[PDB]
PDB file of C-alpha atoms and ligand atoms in Angstrom:
ATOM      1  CA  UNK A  17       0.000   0.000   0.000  1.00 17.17           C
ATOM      2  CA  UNK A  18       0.889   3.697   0.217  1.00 18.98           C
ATOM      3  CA  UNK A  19       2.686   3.325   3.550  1.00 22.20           C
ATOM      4  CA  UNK A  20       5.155   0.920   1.603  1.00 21.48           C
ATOM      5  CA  UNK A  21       8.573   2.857   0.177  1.00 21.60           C
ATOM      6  CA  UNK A  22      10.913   0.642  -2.168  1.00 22.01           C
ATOM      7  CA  UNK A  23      14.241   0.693  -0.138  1.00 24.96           C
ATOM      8  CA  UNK A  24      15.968   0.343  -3.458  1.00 25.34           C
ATOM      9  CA  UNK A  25      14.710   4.278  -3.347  1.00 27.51           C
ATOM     10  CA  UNK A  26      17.329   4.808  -0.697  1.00 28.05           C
ATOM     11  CA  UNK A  27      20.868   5.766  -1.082  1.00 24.31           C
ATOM     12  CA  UNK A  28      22.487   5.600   2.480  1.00 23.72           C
ATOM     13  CA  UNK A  29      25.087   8.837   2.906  1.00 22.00           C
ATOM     14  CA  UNK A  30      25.851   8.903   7.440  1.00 24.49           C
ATOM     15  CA  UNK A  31      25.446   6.867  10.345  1.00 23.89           C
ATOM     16  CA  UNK A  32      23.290   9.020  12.825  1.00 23.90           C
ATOM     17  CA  UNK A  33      23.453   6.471  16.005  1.00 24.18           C
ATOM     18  CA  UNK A  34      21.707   3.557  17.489  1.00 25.25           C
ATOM     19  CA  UNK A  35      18.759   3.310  19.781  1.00 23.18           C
ATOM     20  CA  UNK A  36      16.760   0.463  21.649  1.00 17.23           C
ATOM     21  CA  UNK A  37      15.722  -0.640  17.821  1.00 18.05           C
ATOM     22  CA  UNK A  38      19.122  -0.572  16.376  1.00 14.92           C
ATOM     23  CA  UNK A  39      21.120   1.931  13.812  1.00 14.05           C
ATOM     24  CA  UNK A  40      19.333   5.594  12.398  1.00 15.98           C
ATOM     25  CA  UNK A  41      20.967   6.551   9.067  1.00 16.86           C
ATOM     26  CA  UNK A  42      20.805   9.681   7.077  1.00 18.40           C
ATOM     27  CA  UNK A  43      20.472   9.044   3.211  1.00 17.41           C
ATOM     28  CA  UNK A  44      18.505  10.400  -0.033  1.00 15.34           C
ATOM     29  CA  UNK A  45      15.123   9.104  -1.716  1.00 19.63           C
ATOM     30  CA  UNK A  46      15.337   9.091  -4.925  1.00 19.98           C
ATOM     31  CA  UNK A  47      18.394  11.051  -5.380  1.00 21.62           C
ATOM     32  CA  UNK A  48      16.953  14.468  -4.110  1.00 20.29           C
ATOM     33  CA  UNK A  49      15.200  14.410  -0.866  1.00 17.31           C
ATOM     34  CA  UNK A  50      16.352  13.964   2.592  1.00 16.12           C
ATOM     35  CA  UNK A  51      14.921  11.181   4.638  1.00 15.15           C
ATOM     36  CA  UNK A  52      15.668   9.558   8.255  1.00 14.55           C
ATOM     37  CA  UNK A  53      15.824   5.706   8.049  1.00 13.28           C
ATOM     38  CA  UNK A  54      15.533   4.156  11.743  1.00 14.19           C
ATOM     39  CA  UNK A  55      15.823   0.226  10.974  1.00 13.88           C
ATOM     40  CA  UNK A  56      14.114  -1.866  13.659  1.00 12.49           C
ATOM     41  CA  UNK A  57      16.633  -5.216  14.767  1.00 12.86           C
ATOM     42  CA  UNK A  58      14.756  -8.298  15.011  1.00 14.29           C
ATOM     43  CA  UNK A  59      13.059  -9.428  17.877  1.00 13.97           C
ATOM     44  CA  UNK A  60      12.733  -5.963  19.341  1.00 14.92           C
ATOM     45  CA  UNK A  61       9.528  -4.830  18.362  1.00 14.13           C
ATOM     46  CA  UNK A  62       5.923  -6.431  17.602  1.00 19.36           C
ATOM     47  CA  UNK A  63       6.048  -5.655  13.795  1.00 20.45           C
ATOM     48  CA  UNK A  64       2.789  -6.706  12.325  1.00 20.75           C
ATOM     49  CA  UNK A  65       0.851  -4.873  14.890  1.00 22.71           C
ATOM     50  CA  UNK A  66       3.250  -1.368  14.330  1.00 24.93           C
ATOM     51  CA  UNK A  67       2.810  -1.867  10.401  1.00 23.30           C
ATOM     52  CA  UNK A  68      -1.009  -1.856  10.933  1.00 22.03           C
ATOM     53  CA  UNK A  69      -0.756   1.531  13.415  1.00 23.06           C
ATOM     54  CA  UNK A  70       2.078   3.148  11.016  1.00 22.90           C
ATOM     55  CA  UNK A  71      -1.106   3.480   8.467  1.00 22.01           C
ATOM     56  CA  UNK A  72      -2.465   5.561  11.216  1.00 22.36           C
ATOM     57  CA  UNK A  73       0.714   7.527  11.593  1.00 23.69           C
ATOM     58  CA  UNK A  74       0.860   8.460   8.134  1.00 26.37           C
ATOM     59  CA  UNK A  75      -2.538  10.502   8.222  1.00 26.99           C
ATOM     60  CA  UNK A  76      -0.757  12.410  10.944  1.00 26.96           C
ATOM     61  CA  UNK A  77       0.581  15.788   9.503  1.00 26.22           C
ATOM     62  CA  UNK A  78       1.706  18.748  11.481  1.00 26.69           C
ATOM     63  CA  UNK A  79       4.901  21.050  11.499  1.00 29.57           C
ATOM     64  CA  UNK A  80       5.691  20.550  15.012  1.00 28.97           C
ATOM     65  CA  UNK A  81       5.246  16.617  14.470  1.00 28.61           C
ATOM     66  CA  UNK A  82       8.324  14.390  12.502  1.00 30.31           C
ATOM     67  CA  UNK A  83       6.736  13.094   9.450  1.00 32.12           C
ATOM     68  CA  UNK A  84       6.592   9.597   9.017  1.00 31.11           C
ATOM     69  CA  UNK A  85       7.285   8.978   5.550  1.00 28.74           C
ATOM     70  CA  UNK A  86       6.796   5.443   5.484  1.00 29.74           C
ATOM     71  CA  UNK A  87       7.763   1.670   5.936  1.00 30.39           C
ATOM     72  CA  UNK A  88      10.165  -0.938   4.386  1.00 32.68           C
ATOM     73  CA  UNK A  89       8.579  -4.323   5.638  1.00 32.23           C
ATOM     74  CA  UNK A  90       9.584  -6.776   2.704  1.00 35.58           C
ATOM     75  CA  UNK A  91      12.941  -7.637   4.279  1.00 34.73           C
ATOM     76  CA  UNK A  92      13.568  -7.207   8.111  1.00 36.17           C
ATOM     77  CA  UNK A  93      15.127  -5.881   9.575  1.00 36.38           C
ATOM     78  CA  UNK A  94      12.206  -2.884   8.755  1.00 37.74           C
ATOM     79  CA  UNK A  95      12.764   0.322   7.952  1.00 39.29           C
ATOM     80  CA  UNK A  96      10.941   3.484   9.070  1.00 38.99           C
ATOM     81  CA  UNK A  97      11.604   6.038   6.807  1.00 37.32           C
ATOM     82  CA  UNK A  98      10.929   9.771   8.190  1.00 36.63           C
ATOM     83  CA  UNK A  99      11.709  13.925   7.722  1.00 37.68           C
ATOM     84  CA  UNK A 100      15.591  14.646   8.435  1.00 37.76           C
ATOM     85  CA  UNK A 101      16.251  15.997  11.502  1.00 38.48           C
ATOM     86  CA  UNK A 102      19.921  17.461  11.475  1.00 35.94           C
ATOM     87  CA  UNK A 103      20.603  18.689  14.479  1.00 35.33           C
ATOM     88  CA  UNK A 104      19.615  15.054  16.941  1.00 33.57           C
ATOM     89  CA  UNK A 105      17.615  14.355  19.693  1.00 33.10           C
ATOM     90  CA  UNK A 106      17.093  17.598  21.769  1.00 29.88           C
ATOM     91  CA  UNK A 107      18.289  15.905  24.931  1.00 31.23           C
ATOM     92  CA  UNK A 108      21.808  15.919  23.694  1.00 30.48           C
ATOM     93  CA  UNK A 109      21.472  19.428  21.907  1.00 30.02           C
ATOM     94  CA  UNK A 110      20.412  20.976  24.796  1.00 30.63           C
ATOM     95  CA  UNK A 111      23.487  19.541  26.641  1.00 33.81           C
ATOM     96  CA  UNK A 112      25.675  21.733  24.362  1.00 31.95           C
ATOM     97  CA  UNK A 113      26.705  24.399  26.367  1.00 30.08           C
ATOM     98  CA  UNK A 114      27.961  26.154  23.165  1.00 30.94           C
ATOM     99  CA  UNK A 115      25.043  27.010  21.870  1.00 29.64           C
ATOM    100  CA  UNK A 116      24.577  29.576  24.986  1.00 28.95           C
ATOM    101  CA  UNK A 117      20.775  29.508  24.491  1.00 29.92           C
ATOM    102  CA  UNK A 118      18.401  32.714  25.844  1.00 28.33           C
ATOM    103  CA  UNK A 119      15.368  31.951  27.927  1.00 29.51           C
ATOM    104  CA  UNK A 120      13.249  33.183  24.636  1.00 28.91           C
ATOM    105  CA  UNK A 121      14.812  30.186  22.980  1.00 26.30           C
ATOM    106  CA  UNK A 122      13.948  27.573  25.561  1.00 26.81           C
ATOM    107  CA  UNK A 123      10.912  29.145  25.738  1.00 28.84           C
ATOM    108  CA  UNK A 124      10.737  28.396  21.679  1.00 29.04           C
ATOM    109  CA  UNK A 125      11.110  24.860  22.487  1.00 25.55           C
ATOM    110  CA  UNK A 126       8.623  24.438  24.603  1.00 25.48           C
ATOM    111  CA  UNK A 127       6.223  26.006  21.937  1.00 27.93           C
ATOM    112  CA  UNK A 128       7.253  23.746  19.353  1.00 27.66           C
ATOM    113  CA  UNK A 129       6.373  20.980  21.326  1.00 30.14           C
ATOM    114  CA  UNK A 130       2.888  22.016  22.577  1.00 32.75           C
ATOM    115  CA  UNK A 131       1.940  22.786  19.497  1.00 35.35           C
ATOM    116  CA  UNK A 132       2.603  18.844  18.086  1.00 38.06           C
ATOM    117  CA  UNK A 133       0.870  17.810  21.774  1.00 35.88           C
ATOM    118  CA  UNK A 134      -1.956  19.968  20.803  1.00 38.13           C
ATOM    119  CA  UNK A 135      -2.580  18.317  17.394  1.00 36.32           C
ATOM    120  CA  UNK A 136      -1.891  14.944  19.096  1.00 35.48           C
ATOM    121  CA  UNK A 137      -4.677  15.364  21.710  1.00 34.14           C
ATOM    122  CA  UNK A 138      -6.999  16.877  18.874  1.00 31.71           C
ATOM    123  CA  UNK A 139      -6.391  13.684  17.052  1.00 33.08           C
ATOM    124  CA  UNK A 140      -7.022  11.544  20.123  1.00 31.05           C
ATOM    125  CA  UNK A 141      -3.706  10.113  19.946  1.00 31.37           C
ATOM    126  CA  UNK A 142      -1.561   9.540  23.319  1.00 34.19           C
ATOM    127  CA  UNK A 143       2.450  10.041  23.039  1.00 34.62           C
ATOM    128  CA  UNK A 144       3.105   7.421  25.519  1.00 30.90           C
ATOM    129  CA  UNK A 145       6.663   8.343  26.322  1.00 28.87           C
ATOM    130  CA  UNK A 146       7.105  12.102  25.638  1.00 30.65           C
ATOM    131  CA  UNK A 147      10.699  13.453  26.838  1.00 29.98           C
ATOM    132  CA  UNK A 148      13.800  15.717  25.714  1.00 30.30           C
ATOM    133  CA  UNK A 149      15.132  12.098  24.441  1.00 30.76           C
ATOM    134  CA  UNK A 150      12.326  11.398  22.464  1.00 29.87           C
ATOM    135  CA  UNK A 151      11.911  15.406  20.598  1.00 29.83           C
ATOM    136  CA  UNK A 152      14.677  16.196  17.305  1.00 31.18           C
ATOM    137  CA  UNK A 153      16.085  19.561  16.280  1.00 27.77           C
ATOM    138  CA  UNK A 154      15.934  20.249  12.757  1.00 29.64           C
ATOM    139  CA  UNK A 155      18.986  22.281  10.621  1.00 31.74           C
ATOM    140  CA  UNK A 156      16.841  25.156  11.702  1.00 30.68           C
ATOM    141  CA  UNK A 157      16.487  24.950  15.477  1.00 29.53           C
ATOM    142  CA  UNK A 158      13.132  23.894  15.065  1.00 26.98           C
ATOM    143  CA  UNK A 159      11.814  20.995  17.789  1.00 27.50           C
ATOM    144  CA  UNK A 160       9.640  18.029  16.720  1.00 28.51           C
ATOM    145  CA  UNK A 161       7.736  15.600  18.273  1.00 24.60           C
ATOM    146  CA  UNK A 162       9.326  11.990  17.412  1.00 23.51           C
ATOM    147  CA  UNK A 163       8.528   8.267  18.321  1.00 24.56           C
ATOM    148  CA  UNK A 164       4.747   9.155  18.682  1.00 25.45           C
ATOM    149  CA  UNK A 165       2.968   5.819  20.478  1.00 26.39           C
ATOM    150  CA  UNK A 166       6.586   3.613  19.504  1.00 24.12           C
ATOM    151  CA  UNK A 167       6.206   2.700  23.304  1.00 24.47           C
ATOM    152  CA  UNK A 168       3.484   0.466  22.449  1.00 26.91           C
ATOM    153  CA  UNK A 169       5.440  -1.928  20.377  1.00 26.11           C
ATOM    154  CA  UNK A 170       8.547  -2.606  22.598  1.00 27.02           C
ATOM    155  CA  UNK A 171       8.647  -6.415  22.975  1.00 26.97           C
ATOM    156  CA  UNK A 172      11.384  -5.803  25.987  1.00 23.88           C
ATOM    157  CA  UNK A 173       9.559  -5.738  29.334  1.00 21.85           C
ATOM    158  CA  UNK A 174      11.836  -3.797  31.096  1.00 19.33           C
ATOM    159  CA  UNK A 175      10.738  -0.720  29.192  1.00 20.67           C
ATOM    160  CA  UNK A 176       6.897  -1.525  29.313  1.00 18.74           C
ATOM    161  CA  UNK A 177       5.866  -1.121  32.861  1.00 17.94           C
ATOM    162  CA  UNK A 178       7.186   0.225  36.030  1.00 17.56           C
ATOM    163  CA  UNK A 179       7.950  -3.087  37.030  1.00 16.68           C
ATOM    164  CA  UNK A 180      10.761  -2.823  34.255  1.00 14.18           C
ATOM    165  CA  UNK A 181      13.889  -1.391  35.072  1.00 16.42           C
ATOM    166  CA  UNK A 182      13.672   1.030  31.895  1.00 16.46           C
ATOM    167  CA  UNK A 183      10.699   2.547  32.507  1.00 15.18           C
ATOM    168  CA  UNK A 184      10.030   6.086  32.130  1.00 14.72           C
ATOM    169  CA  UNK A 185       9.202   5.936  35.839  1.00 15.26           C
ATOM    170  CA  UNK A 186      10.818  10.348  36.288  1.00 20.15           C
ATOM    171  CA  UNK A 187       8.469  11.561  33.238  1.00 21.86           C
ATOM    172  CA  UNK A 188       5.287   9.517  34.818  1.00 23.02           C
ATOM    173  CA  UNK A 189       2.484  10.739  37.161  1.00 23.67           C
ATOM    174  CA  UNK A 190       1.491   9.398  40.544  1.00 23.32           C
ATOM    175  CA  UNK A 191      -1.858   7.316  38.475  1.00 20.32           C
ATOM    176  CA  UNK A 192       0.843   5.900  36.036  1.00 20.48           C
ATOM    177  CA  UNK A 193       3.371   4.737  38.857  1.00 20.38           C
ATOM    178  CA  UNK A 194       0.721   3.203  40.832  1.00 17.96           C
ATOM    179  CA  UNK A 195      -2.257   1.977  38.725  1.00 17.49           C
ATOM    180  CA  UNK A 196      -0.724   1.772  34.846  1.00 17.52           C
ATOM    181  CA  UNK A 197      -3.375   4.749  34.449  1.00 15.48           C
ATOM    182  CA  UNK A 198      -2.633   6.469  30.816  1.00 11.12           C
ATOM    183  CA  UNK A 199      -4.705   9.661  29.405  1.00 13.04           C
ATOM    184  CA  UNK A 200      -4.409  12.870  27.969  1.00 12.58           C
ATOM    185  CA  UNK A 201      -3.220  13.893  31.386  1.00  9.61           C
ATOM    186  CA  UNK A 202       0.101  11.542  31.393  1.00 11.21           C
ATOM    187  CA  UNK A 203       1.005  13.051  28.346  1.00 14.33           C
ATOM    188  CA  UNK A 204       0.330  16.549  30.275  1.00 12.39           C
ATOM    189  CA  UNK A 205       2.220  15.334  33.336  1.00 12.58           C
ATOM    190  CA  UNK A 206       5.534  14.707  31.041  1.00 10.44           C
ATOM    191  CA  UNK A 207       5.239  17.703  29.028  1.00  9.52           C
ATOM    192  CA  UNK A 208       5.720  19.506  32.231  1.00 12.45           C
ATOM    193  CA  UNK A 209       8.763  17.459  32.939  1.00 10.17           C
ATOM    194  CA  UNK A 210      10.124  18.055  29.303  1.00 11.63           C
ATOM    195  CA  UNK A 211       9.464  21.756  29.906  1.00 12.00           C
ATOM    196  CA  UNK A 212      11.670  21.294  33.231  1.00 11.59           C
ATOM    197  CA  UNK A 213      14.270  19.766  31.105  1.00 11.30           C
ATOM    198  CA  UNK A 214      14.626  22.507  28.448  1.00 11.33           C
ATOM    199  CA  UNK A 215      15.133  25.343  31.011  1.00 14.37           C
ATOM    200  CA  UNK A 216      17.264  22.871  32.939  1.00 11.12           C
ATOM    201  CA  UNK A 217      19.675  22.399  29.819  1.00 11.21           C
ATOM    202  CA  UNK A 218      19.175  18.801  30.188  1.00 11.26           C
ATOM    203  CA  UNK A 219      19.743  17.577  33.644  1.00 11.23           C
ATOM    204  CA  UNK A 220      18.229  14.175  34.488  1.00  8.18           C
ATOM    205  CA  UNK A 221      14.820  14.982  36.234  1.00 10.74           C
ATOM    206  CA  UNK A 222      15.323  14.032  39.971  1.00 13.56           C
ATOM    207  CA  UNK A 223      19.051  13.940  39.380  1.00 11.20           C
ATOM    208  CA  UNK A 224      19.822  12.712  42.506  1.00  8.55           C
ATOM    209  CA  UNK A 225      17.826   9.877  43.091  1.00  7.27           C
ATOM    210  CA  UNK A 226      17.092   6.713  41.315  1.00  8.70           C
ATOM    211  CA  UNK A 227      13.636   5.600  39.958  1.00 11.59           C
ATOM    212  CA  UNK A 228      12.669   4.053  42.824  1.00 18.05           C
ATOM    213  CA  UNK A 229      13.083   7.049  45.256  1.00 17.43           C
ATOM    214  CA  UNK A 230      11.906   9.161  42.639  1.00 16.30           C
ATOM    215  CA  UNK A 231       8.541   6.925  42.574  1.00 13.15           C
ATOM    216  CA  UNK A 232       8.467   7.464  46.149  1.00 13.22           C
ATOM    217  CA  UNK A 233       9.247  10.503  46.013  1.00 10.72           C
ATOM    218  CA  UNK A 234       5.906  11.067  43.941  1.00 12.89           C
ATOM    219  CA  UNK A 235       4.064   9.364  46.583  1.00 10.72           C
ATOM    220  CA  UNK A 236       4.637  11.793  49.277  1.00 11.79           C
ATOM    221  CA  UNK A 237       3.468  14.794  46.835  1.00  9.69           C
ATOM    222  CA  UNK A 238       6.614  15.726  46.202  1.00  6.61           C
ATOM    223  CA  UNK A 239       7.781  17.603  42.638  1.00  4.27           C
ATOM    224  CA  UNK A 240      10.565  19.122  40.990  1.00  2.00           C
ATOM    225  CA  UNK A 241      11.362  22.533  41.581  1.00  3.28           C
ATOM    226  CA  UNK A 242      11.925  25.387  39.238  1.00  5.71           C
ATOM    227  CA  UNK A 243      15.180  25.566  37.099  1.00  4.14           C
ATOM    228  CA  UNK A 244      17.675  28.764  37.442  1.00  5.76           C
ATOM    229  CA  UNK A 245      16.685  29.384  33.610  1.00  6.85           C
ATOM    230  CA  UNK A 246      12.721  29.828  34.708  1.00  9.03           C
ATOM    231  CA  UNK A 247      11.211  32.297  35.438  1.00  7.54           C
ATOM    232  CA  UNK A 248       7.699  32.384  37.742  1.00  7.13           C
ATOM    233  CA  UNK A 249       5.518  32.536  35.055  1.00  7.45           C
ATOM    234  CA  UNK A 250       7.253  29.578  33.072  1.00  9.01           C
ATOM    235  CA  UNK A 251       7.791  27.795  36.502  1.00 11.56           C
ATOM    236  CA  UNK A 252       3.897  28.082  37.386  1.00 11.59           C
ATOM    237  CA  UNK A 253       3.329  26.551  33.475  1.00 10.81           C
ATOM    238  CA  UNK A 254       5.276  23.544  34.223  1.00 13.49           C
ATOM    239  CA  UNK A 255       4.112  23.014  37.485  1.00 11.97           C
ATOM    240  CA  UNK A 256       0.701  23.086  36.414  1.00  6.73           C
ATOM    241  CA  UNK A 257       1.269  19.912  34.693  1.00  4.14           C
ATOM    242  CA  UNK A 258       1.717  17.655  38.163  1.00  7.75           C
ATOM    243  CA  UNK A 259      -1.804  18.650  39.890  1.00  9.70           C
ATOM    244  CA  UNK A 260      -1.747  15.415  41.687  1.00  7.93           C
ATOM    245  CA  UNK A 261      -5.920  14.974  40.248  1.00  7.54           C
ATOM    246  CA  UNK A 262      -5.316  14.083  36.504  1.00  6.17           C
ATOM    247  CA  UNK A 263      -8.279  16.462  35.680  1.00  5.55           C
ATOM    248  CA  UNK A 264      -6.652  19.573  37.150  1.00  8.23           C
ATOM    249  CA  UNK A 265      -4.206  19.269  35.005  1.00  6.84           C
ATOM    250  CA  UNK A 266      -4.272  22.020  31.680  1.00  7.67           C
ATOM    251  CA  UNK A 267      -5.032  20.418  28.035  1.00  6.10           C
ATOM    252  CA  UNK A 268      -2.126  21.134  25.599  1.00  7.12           C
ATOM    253  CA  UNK A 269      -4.714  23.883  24.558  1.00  7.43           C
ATOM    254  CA  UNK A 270      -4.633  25.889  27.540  1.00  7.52           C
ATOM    255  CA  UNK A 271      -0.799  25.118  27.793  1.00  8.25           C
ATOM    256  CA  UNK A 272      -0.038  26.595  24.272  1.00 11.44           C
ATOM    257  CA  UNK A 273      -2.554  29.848  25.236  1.00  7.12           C
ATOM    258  CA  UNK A 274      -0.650  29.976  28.298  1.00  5.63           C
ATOM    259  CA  UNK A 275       2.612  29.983  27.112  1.00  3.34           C
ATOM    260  CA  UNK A 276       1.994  32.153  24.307  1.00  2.87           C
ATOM    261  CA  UNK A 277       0.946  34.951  26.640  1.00  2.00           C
ATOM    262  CA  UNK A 278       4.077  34.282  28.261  1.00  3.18           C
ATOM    263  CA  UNK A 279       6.519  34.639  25.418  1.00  5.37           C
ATOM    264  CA  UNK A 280       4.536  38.276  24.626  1.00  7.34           C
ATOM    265  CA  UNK A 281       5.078  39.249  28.295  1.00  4.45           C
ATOM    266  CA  UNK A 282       8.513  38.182  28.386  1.00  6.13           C
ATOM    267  CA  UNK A 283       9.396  39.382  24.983  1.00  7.26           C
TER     268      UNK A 283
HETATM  269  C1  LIG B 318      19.072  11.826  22.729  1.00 12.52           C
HETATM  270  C2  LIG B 318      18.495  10.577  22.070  1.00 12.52           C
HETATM  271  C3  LIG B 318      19.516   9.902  21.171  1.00 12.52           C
HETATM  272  O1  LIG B 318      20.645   9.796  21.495  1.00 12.52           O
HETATM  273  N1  LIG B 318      19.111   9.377  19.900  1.00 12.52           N
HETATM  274  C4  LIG B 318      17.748   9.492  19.308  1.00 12.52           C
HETATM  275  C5  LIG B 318      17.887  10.275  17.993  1.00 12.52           C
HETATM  276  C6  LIG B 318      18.835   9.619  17.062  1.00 12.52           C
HETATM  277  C7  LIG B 318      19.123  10.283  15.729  1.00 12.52           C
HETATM  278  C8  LIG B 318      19.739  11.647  15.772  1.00 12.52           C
HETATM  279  C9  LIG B 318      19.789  12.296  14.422  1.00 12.52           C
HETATM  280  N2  LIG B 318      18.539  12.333  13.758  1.00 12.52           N
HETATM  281  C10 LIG B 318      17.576  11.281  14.001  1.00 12.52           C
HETATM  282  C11 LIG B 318      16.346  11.040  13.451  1.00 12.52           C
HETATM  283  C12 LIG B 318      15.753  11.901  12.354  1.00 12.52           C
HETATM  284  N3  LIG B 318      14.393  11.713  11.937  1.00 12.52           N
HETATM  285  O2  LIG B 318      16.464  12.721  11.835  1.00 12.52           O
HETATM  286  C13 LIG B 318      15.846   9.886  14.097  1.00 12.52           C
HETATM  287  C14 LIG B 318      14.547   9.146  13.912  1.00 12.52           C
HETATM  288  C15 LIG B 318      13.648   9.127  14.960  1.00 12.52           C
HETATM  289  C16 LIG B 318      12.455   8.448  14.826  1.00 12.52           C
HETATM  290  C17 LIG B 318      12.194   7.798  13.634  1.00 12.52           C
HETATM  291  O3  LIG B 318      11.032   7.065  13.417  1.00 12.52           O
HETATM  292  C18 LIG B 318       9.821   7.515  13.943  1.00 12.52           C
HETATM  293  C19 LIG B 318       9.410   8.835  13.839  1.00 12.52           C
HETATM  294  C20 LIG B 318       8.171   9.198  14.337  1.00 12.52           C
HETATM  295  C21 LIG B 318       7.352   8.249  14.930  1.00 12.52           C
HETATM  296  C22 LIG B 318       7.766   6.933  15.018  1.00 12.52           C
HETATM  297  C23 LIG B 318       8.997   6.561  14.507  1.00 12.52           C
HETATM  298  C24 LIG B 318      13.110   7.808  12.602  1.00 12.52           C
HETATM  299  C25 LIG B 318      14.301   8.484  12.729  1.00 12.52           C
HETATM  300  N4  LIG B 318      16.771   9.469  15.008  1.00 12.52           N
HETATM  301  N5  LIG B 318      17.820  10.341  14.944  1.00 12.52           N
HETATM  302  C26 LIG B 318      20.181   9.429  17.646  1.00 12.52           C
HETATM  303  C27 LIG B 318      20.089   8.716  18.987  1.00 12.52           C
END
């Protein structure tokens, strides 16, 4: 079908790095355009049931949101083919100290992002694991939403529940941690933390602990607390995110109004 690309299409040029999947390579398609190719190792994923949701992720189209492109599923391992994002996951770009970034910038970030969360949630479709590790930088500066729903498909346990020893237990709220509870309002709760990233240049969330005292540190109604880079207003954003009731928490709606009339006050 149309979510099927002919890897004989592809012309492989650089070696971008390897995930839980495997290798990400930059190439061509056809010669001219640029295209991400993450190939998926065998065994790690639960293929026929992503190739049925990747139709799904095709009909997805925003500018905040990497574009899926398509699939290579004739040989394995599989190939997801996707928009170019030069500049790498924006965990590690914010670690650049180089780039000496102003608050307006993070702020930037943060934008970017909400705006992909807002499609998402007007599209009914949960991220699953949103974090700094799982958003790109384009040649441009501009952040996009990557490995929308991927979670879903992990066939290694240790990354699909808190009872795994990779779980995103630091981006997840209290109903996650205890109950396995996903919504709208996870994806909330770990914007927040991704916010706390950005104006934290990257620090690990609850640096100091591990996941299990972070976890427990979440059952006592403890949070984070605001980043040098923050100021009130963007502190009182993020921190809107972790109401401990799921349904106090904003929609990525009210975020993105929110932090718009931040980035004209603060302008
Ligand atoms: C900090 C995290 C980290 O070290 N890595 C994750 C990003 C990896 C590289 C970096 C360079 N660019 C890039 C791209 C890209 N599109 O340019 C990708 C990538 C990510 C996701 C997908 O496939 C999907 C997209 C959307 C939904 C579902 C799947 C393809 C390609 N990965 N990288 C380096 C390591």
């Amino acid at each position: 079908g149309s979510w099927e690309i002919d890897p004989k299409d592809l012309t492989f040029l650089k070696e971008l790095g390897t995930g839980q999947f495997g290798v990400v390579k930059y190439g061509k398609w056809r010669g001219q355009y640029d295209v991400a190719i993450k190939m998926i190792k065998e065994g790690s994923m639960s293929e026929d049931e992503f190739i049925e949701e990747a139709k799904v992720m095709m009909n997805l189209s925003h500018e905040k949101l990497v574009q899926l492109y398509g699939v290579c599923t004739k040989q394995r391992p599989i190939f997801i083919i996707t928009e170019y994002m030069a500049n790498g996951c924006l965990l590690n770009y914010l670690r650049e100290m180089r780039h000496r970034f102003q608050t307006q910038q993070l702020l930037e970030m943060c934008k970017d992002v909400c705006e992909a969360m807002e499609y998402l949630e007007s599209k009914q479709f949960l991220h699953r694991d949103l974090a700094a590790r799982n958003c790109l930088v384009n040649d441009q500066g501009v952040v996009k939403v990557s490995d929308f729903g991927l979670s879903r498909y992990v066939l290694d346990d240790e990354y699909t529940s808190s009872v795994g020893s990779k779980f995103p237990v630091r981006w997840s709220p209290p109903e996650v941690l205890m109950y396995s509870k996903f919504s709208s309002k996870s994806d909330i709760w770990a914007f927040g933390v991704l916010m706390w990233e950005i104006y934290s240049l990257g620090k690990m969330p609850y640096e100091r602990f591990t996941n299990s005292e972070t976890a427990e540190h979440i059952a006592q109604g403890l949070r984070l607390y605001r980043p040098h880079l923050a100021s009130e207003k963007v502190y009182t954003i993020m921190y809107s995110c972790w109401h401990e009731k799921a349904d106090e928490r904003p929609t990525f709606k009210i975020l993105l109004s929110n932090i718009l009339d931040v980035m004209d006050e603060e302008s």
